[PDB]
Coordinates of C-alpha atoms and ligand atoms in Angstrom, one line a residue:
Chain A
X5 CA 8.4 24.6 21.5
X6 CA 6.9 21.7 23.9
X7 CA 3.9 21.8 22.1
X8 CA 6.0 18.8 19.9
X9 CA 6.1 16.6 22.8
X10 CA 2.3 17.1 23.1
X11 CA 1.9 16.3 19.3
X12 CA 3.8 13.2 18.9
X13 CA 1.8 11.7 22.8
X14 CA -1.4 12.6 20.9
X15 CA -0.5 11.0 17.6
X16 CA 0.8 7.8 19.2
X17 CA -2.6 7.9 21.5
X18 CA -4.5 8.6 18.3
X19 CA -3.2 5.0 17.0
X20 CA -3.7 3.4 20.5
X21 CA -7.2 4.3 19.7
X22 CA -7.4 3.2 16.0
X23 CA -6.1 -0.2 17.0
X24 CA -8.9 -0.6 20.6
X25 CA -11.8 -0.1 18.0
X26 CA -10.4 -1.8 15.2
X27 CA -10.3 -5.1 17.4
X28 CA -13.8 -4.6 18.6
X29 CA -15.3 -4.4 15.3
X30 CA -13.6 -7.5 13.5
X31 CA -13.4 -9.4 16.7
X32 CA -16.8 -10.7 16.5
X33 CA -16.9 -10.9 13.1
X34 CA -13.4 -13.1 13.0
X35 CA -14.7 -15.4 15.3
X36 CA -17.9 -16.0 14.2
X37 CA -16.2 -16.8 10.9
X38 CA -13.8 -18.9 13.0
X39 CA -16.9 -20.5 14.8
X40 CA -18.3 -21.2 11.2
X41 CA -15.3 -23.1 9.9
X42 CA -15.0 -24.9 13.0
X43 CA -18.3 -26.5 12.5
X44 CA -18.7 -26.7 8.7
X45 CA -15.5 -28.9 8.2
X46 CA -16.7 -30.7 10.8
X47 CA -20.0 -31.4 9.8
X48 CA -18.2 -32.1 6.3
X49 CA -16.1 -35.1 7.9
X50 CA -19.1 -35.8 10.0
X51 CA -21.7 -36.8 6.7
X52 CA -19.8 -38.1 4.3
X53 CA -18.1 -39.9 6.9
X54 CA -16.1 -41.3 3.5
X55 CA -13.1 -39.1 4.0
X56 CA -10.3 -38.7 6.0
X57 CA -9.4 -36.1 8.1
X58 CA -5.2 -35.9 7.5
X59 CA -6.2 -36.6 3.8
X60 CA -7.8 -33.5 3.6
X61 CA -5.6 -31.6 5.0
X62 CA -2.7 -31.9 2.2
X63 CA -5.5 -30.6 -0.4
X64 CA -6.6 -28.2 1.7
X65 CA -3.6 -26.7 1.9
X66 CA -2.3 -26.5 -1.1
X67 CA -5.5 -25.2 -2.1
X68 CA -5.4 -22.3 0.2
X69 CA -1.9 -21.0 -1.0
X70 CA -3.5 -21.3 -4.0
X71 CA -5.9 -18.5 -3.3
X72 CA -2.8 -16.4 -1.2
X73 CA -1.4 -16.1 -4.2
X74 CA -4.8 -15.1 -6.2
X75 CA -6.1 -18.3 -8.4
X76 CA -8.8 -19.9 -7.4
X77 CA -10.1 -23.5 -7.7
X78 CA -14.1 -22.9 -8.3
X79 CA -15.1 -22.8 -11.7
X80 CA -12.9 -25.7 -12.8
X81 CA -9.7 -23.7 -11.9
X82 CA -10.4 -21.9 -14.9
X83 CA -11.0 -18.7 -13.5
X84 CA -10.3 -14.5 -15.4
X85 CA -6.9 -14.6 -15.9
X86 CA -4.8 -13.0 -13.0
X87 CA -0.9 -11.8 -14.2
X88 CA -2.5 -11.1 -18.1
X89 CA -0.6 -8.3 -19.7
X90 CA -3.0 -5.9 -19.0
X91 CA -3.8 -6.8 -15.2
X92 CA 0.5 -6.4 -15.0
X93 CA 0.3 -2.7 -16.5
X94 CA -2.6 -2.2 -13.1
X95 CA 0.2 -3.3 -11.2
X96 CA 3.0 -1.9 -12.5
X97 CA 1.0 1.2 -11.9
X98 CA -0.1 0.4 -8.7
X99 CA 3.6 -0.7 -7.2
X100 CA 5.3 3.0 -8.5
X101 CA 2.0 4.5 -7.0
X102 CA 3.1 2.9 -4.2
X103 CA -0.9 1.8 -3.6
X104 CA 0.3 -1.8 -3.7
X105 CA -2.5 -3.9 -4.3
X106 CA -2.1 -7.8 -4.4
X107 CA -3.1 -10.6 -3.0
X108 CA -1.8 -12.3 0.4
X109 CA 1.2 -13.6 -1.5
X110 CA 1.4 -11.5 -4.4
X111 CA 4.9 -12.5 -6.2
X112 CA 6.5 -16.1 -6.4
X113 CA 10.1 -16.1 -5.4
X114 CA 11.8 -15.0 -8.7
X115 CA 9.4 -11.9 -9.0
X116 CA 10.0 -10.3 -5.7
X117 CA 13.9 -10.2 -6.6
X118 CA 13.2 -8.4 -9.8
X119 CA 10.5 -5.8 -7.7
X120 CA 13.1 -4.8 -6.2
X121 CA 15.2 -3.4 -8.5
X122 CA 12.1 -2.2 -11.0
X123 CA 11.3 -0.5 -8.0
X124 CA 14.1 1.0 -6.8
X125 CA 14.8 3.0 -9.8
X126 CA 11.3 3.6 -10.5
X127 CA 9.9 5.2 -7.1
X128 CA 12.3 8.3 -7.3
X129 CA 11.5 8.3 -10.9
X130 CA 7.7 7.9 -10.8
X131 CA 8.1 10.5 -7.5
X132 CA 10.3 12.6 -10.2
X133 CA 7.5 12.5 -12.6
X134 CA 5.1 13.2 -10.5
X135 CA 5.8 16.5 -9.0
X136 CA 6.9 17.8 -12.5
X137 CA 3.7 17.7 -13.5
X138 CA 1.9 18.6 -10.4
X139 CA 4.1 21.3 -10.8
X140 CA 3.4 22.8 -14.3
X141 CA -0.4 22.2 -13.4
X142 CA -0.8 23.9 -10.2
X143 CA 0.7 27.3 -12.3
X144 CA -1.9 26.1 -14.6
X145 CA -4.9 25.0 -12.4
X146 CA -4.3 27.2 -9.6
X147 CA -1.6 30.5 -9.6
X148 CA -2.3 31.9 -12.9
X149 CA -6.3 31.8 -12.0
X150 CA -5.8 33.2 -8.4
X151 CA -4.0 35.9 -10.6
X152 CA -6.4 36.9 -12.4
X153 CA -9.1 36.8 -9.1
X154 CA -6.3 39.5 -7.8
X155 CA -6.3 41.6 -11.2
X156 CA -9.9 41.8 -11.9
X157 CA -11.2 42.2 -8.4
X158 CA -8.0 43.6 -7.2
X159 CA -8.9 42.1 -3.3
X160 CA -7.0 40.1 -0.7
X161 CA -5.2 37.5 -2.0
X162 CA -5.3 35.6 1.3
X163 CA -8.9 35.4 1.0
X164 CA -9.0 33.7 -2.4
X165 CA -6.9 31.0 -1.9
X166 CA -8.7 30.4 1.5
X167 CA -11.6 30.3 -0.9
X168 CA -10.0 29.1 -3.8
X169 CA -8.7 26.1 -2.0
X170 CA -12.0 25.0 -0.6
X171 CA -13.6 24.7 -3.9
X172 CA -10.9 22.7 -5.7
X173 CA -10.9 20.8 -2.6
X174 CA -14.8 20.0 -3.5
X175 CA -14.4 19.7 -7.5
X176 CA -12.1 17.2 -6.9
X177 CA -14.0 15.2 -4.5
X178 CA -17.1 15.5 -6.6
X179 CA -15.1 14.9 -10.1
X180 CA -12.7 12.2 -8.3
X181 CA -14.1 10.5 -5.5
X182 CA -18.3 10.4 -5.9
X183 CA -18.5 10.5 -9.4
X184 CA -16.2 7.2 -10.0
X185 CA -17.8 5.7 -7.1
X186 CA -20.6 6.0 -8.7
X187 CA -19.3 4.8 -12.1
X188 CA -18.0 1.5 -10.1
X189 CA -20.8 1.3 -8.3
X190 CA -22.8 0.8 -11.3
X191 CA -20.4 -0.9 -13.5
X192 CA -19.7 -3.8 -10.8
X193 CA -22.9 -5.8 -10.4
X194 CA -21.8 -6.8 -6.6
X195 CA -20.9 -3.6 -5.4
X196 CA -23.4 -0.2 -3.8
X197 CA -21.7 3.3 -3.0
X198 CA -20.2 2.9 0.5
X199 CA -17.5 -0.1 -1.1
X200 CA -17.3 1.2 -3.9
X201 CA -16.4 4.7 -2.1
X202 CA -13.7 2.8 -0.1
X203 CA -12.1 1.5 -3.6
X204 CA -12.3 5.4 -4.7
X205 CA -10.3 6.6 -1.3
X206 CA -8.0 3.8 -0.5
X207 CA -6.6 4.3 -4.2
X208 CA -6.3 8.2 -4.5
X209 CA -4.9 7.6 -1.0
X210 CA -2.0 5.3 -1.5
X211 CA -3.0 2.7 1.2
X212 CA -4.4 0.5 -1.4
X213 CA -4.6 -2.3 1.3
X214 CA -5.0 -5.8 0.1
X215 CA -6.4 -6.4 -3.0
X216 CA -10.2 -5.5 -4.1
X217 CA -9.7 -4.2 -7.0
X218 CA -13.1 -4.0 -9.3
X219 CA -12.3 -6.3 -12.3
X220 CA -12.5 -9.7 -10.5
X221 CA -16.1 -10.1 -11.9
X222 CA -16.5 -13.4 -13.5
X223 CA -17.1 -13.5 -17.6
X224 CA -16.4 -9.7 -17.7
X225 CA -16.6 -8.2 -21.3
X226 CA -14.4 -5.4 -21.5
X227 CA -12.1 -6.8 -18.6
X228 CA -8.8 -5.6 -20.6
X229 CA -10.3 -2.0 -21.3
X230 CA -11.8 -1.7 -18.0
X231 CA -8.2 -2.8 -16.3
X232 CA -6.2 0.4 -18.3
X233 CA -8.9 2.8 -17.8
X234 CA -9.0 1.7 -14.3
X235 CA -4.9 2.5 -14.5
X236 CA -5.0 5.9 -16.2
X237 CA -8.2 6.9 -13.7
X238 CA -5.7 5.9 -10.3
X239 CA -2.5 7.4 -11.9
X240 CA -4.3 10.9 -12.6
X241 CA -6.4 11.0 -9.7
X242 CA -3.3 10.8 -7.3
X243 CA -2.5 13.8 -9.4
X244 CA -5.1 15.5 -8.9
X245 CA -4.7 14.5 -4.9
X246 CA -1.3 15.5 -4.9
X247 CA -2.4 19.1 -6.1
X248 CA -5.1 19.6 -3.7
X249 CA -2.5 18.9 -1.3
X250 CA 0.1 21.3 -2.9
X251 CA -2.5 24.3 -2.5
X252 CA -3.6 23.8 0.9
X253 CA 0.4 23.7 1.6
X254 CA 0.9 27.3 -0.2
X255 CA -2.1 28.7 2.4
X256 CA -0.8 31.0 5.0
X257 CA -3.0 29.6 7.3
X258 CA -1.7 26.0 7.1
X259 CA 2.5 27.1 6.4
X260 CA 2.2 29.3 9.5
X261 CA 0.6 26.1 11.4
X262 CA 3.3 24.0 10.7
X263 CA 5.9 26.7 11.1
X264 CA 4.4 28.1 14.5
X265 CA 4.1 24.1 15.7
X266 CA 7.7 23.5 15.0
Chain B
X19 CA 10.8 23.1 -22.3
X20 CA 9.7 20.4 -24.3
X21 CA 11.9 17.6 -22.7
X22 CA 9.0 17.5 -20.6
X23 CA 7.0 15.3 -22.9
X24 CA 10.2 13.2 -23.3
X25 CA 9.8 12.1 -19.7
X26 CA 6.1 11.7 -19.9
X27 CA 6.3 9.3 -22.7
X28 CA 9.6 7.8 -21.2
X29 CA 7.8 7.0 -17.7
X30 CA 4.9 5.8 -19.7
X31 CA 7.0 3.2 -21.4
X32 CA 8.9 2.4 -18.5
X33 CA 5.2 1.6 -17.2
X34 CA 4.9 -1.1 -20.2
X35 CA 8.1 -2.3 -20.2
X36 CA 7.2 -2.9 -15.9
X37 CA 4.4 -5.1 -17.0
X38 CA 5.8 -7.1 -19.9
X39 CA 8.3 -8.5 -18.0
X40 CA 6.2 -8.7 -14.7
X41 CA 4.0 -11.3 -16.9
X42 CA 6.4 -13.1 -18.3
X43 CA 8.0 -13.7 -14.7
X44 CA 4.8 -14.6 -13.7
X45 CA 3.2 -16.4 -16.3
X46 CA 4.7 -19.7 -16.7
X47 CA 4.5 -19.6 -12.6
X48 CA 1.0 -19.3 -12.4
X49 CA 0.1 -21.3 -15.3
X50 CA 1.8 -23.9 -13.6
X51 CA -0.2 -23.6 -10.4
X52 CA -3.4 -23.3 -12.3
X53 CA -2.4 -26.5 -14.3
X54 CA -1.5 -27.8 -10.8
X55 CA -5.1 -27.3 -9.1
X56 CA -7.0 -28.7 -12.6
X57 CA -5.4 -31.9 -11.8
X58 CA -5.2 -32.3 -8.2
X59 CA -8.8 -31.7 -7.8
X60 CA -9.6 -33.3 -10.8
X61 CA -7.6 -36.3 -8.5
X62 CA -9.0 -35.8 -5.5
X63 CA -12.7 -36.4 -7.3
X64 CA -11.2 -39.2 -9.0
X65 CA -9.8 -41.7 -6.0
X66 CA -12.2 -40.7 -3.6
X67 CA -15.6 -41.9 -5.9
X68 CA -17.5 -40.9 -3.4
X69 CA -17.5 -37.3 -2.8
X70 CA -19.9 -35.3 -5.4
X71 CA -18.6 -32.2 -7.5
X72 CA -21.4 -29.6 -7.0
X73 CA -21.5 -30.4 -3.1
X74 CA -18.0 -30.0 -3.3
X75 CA -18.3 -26.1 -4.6
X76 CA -20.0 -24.8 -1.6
X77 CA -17.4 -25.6 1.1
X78 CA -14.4 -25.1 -1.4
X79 CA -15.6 -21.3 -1.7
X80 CA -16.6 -20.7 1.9
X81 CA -12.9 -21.6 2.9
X82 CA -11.3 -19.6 0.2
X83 CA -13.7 -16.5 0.9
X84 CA -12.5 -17.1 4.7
X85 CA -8.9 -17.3 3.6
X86 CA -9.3 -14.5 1.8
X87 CA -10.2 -12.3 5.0
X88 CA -6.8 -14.2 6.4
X89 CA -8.2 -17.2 8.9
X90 CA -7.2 -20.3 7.8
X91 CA -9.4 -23.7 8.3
X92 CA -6.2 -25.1 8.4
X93 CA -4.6 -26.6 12.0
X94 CA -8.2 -27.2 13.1
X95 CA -9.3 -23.7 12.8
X96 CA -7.6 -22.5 15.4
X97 CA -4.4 -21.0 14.3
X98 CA -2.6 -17.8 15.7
X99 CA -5.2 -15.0 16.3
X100 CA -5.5 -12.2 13.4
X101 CA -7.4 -9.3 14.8
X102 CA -5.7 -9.3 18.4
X103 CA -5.2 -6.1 19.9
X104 CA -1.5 -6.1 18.9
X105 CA -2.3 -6.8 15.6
X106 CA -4.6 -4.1 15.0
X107 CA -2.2 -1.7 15.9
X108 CA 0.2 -3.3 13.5
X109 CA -2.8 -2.7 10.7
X110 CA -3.3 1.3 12.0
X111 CA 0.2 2.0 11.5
X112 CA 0.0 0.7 8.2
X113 CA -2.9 2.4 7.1
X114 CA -1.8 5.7 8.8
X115 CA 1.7 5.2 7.0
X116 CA 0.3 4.5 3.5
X117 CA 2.1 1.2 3.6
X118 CA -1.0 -0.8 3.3
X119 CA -0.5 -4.4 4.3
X120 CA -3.6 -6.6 4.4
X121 CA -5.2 -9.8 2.7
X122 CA -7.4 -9.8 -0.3
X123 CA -10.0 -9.0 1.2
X124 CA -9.0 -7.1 4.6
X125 CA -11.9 -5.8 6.4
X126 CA -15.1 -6.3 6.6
X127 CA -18.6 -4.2 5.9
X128 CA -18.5 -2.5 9.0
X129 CA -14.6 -2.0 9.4
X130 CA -14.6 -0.4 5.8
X131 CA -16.8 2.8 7.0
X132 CA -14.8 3.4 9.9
X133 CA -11.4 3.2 7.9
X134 CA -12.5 6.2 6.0
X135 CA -13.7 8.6 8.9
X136 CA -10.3 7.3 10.5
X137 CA -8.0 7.9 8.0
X138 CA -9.5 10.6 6.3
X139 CA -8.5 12.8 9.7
X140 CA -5.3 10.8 10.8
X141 CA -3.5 11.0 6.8
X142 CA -2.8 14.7 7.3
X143 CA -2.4 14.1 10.9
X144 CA 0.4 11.8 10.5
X145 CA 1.9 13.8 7.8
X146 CA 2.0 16.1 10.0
X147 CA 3.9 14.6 12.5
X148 CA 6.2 12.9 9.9
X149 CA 7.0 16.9 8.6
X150 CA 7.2 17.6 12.1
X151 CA 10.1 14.9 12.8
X152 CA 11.8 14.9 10.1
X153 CA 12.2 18.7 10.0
X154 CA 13.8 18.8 13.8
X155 CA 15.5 15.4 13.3
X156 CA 17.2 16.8 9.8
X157 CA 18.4 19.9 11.9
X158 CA 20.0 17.8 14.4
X159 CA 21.3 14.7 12.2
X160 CA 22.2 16.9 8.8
X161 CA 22.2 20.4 8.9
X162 CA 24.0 21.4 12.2
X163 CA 26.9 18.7 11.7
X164 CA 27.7 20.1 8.3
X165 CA 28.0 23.4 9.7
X166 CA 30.5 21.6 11.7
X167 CA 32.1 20.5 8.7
X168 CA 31.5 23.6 7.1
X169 CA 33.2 25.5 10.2
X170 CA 36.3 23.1 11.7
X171 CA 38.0 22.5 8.0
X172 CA 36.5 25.9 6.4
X173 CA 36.0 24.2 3.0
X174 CA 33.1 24.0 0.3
X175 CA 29.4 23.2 1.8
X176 CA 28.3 21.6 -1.7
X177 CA 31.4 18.9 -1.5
X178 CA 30.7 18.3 2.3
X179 CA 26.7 18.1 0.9
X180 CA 27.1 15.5 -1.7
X181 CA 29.5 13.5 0.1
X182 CA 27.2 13.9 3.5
X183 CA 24.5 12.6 2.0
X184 CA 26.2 9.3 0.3
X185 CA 27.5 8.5 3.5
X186 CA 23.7 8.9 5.2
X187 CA 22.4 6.9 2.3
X188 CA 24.9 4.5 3.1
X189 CA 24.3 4.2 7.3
X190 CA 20.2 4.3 7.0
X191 CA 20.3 0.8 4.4
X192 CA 23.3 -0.6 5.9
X193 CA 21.1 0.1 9.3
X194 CA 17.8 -0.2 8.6
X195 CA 17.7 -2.4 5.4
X196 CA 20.8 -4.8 5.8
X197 CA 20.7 -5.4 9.6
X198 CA 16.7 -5.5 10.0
X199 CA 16.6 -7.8 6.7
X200 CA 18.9 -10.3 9.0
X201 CA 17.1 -10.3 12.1
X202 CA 13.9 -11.0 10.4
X203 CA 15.7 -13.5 8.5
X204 CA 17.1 -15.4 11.5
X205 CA 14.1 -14.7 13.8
X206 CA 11.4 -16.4 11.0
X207 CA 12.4 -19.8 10.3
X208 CA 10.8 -19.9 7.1
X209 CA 12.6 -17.4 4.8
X210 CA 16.1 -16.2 3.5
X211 CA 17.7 -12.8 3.2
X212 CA 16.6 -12.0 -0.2
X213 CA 12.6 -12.9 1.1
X214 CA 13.4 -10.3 4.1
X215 CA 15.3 -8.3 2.8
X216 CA 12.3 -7.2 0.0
X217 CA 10.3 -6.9 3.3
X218 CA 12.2 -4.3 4.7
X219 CA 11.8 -2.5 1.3
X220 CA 8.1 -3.4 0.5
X221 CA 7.4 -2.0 4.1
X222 CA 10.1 1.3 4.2
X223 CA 8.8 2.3 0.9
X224 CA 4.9 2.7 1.1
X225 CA 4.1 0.4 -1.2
X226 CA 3.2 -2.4 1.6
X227 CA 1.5 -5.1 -1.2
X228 CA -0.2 -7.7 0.1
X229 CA 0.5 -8.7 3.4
X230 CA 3.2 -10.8 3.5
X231 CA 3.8 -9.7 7.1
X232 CA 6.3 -11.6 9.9
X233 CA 4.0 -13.1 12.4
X234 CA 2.4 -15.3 11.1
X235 CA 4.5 -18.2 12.1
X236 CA 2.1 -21.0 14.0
X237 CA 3.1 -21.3 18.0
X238 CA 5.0 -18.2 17.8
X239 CA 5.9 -17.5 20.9
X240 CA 6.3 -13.6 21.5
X241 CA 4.1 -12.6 19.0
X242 CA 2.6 -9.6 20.4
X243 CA 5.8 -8.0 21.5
X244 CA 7.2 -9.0 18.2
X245 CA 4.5 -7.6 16.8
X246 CA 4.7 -3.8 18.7
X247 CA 8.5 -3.9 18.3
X248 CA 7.8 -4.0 14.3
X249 CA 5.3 -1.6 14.1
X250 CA 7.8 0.8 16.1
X251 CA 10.6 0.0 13.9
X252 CA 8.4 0.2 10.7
X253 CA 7.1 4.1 11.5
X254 CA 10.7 5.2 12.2
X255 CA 12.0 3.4 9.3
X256 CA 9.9 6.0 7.2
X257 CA 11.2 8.4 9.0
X258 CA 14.9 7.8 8.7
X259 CA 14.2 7.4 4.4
X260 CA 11.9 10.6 4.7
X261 CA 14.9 11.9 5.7
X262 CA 17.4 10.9 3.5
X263 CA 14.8 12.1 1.0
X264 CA 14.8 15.0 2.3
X265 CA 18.3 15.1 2.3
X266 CA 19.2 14.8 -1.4
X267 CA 16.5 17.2 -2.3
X268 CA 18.8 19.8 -0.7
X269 CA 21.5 19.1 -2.7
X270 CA 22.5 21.7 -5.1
X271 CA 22.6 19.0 -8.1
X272 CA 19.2 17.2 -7.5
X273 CA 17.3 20.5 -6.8
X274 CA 18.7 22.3 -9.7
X275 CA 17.7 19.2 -12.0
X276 CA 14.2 19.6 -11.4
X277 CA 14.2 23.5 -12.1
X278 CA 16.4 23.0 -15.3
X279 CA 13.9 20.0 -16.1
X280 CA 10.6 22.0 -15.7
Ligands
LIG313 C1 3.3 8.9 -4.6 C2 4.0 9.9 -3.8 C3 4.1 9.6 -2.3 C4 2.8 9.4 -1.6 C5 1.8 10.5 -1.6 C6 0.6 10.4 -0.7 C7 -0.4 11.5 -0.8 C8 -1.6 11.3 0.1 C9 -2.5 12.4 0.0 C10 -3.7 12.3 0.9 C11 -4.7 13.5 0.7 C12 -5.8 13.5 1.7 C13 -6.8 12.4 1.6 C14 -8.0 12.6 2.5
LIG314 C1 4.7 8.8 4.3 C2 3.7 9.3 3.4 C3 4.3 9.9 2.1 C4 5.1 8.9 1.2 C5 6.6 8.9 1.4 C6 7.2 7.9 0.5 C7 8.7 7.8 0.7 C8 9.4 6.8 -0.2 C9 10.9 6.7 -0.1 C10 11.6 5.7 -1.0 C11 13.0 5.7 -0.8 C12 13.8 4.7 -1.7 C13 15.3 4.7 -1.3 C14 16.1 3.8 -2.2
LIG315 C1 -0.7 18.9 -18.1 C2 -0.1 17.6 -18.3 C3 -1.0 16.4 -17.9 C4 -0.4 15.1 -18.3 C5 -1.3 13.9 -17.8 C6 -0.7 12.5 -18.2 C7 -1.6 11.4 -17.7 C8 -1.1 10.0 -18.0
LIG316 C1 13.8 13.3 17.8 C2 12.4 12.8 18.1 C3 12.2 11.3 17.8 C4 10.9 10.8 18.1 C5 10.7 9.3 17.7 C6 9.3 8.8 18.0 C7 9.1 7.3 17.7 C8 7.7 6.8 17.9
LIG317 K1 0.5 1.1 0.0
LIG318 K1 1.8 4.4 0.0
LIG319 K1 -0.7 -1.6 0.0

């Protein structure tokens, strides 16, 4: 009834509030950045005293699109390979996902034309894919089980999936979220738990803000390896997300929510 | 049956044949650039004869780490504000809609522990209120005006269902794809249609890659209100395709493809 009124206020205060606190902490931390460069290049001009200041500037600049797009100019411009075949297949991946990871400027002109209609296509087809299996695993993973806790037991169902939900809900937040943590965590040598968690949860979620992908590691091995198991992993975990999600859904609890809400 | 495998493998190749052709677009491209950088700062050493290459290093990767985050050392270090109030609440609707814009490297230590707390509660809060919408708003907009079609001429709800939902596919683009691509296009002075109009689908779709946001223009002069007026439009953009979604699921066809698939 008005109860919707109330939700969409709250919501809409909700990101009011996101937004205050996500100023105050990067605000600082922007401009003592901002500070930093305003008295680095200046002391830079100031010593070598050798260079000129408009000079620069052209360099600069061209450097800094540069590194939008994602090469870099340390190490002799000769930096891990960025758009290698496998690094593509991530992408691929990560653009049907709809995770979109990339860099500030992730395509040049003629690739953003061809997203498009890759995209297009692919989105309801990936979408397509996804809830057919999702689908045939939740019978699978979830149903058929909850089944047999009915038979066996012959008690409420209700209770079960209460039950039933909470624990895949921690299985696949042990299997899927602290356990690869962990693996990254390890794996990348400038990494601890907390990033590394973030990686884990802005890619099973599909935010997938920016870039920071784990890979970027200078002279890796097994960069190509790590880059398709790093593929598979994301693909199957937003499975895995998307059937958590599914069974809390199916809970009377939660249906009767949104039904009683509306 | 078995044609589920079929579309498995199908989507899997569709994956490859994705990134084959997304390197080969953007190989040659970034080759280039790469080729690019090893002589212009190869150059740069060159004329100058007085600037060292080690010493160099350091301030090179300071910048680029700070361009990374997203402020530029560029115009004197003092270009248009990132982390303004405004913006942020640009950056929490885009986290909170899954579309994920930000740079390479978005936040920073702090900001990445709070992104979790916040949008581990405000991802099913917002789905919520996205269900929510689009489950009064399709009443209103869809089902209750084919009823009136269904009623006034008396004839077959499936026809009236197909054709409905063609002609909403066609308004919502033409509307929120077409005419937003052009006033982006004319408001920016620095891109084209084609540029804006893969903005509009970059940002309506989830996938959100990079940044690649309008706003950044230097001496913009509304920028804030430009900046609430896109965040707006981009949240109820989501809503009007998560209801044409919602829409074609409905239909008879698309709903009994999925059943005779599974
Ligand atoms: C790829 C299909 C569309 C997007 C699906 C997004 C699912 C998000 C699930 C979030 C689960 C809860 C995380 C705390
Ligand atoms: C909002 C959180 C869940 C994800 C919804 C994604 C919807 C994507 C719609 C794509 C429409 C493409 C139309 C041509
Ligand atoms: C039960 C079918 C699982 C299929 C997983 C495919 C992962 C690429
Ligand atoms: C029919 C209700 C529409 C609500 C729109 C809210 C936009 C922020
Ligand atoms: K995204
Ligand atoms: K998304
Ligand atoms: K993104």
């Amino acid at each position: 009834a008005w109860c919707f009124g109330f939700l969409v206020l709250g919501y809409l205060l909700y990101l009011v509030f996101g937004a205050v606190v996500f100023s105050s902490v990067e605000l600082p931390y922007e401009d003592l950045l901002r500070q930093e460069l305003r008295k680095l290049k200046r002391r830079f001009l100031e010593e070598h005293e050798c260079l000129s200041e408009p000079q620069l500037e052209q360099f600069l600049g061209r450097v800094l699109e540069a590194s939008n797009y994602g090469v870099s100019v340390l190490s002799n411009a000769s930096g891990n390979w960025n758009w290698d075949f496998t690094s593509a297949l991530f992408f691929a991946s990560t653009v049907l996902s709809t995770t979109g990871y990339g860099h500030t400027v992730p395509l040049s002109d003629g690739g953003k034309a061809f997203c498009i209609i890759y995209s297009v296509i692919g989105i309801p087809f990936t979408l397509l894919f996804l809830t057919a299996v999702v689908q045939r695993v939740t019978v699978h993973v979830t149903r058929r089980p909850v089944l047999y806790f009915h038979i066996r037991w012959g008690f409420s169902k209700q209770v079960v999936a209460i039950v039933h939900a909470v624990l895949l809900g921690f299985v696949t937040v042990s299997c899927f979220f602290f356990i690869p943590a962990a693996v990254f965590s390890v794996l990348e040598d400038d990494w601890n738990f907390l990033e590394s968690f973030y990686f884990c949860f802005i890619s099973l979620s599909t935010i997938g803000l920016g870039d920071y992908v784990p890979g970027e590691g200078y002279n890796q091995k097994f960069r190509e390896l790590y880059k398709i198991g790093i593929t598979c992993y994301l693909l199957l975990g937003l499975i895995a997300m998307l059937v958590v999600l599914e069974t809390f859904c199916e809970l009377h609890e939660l249906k009767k929510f949104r039904k009683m809400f509306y």
